[PDB]
Symmetry: C3
Subunit: 104 residues, 3 copies
Amino acid sequence: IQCDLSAFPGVKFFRIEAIFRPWRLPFVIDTLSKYGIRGLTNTPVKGFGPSNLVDKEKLDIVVSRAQVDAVVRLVAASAYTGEIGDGKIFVHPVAEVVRIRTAE
Amino acid sequence: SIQCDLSAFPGVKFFRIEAIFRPWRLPFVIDTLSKYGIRGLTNTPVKGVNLVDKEKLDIVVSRAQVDAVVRLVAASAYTGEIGDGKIFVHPVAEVVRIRTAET
Amino acid sequence: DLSAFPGVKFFRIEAIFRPWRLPFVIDTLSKYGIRGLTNTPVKGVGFGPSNLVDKEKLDIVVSRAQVDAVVRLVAASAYTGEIGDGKIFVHPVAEVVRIRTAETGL
């Protein structure tokens, strides 16, 4: 996996958003935590009509430009089950990151 | 018709359309999208602020589809009364399918 | 610094912080005049031992000129000074459409 970030010259940070099967959540969290990635935020979400709404898990992680490929690979590998419906990972550009405790 | 200004994002191939609207209109918006052949909707209940329940729906679509999809959502969520909500269009740098590793 | 996004008019401020600070952040923003806040409960991560911790997410879309002031107000209101106060992210937005009117931009 190699993400093309060429449309965002100068962008230092990106958000990795993964939407995947709920039962894989602990596996993804464990992988990321063991690799030293922090800042995970998890939201339960739903992903034909409303009857076809099923539970999914959303995980967002902000990383630096140079980290994107490695982190996407970790997430994909742990969310993977080899079957249709495994979900998708989206990479979004971020303009600024501010830590509340130390902000001006 | 609605024409979204994507001019500040040249070379961006995918965009996320995020709609925040009345919860009772969820089935109508979903049906409209399904009929047009959209897949991959994510829905989150959220609150607006006097905190009021709203429904959020996100869809990632190709650049060429943005206007058509924005129009469809706008149309189906519309009532004309104050509080109908908003649609935001966001740039997406990459899309990766978990099962295949394809980008 | 927003200089990697020339041409972008609107930005989304996303704050992820302690739930007990939520009423304070809302009041601060309201009194200041900010409208259009959206709030979502989310979970942070604190096999191997990890723990999901409740957080509040607040999103506000503002004009480029309003970004610094709004980020400051949110930081000030969400702060406690202890480890675990959370983060504020600023994201570029391409378009804003008001459903009632089909108005875009502003």
